[PDB]
Amino acid sequence: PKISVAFICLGNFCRSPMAEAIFKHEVEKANLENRFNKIDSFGTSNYHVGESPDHRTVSICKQHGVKINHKGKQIKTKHFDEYDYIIGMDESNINNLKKIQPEGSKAKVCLFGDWNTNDGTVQTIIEDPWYGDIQDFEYNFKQITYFSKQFLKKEL
């Protein structure tokens, strides 16, 4: 009846925590909270488990008035039966997810950008901003906001 969504990136450090925060935020804005059960973010690696997000991810969120509070956690096979949508940021995320995904598990694995439009507003792939600069985080924010809206528009 209610749906559960998980966002995934490589280290659950720069991108997916941002996707989770922005998505929770848009759901609020639109009064769709009743339609959701769980909204989380995980990383495929365990390198930043227990850590708070990249300070640039937090700064950008704060800059747009988006609340963010998260500690890194790693996706586990059990999660494939707990979420309706497991959303990756780039193709390498998707490759790893499809490999660990139990056959017959419930989760639909997709690229956040599968909800992108065919018009050039934003690039489809949400690129890793770690080696980039604050400008890359700002663009990730713009991308995620846009796909969050398309998702709410087309999936409910």
Side-chain angles (χ1 to χ4, degrees), residues 7-8 24 36 51 54 102 111 116 122 132 150:
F7 291 101
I8 316 269
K24 269 164 164 160
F36 293 87
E51 285 170 56
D54 194 298
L111 243 205
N116 193 9
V122 285
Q150 305 293 329

Side-chain angles (χ1 to χ4, degrees), residues 24 106 109 118:
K24 269 164 164 160
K106 132 145 101 63
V109 168
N118 287 307

Side-chain angles (χ1 to χ4, degrees), residues 114-132:
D114 283 343
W115 279 279
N116 193 9
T117 63
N118 287 307
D119 77 359
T121 297
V122 285
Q123 302 306 14
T124 286
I125 298 308
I126 296 170
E127 288 173 338
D128 188 343
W130 167 260
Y131 295 96

Side-chain angles (χ1 to χ4, degrees), residues 34-51:
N34 45 304
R35 306 284 303 260
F36 293 87
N37 166 200
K38 293 186 304 298
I39 295 168
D40 288 290
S41 70
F42 302 92
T44 51
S45 71
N46 53 34
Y47 280 118
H48 293 98
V49 161
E51 285 170 56

Side-chain angles (χ1 to χ4, degrees), residues 13-15 17-18 53-61 68 137:
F13 190 68
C14 302
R15 294 165 296 169
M18 197 190 269
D54 194 298
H55 67 271
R56 298 163 293 175
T57 277
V58 176
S59 301
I60 290 300
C61 279
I68 178 169
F137 284 81

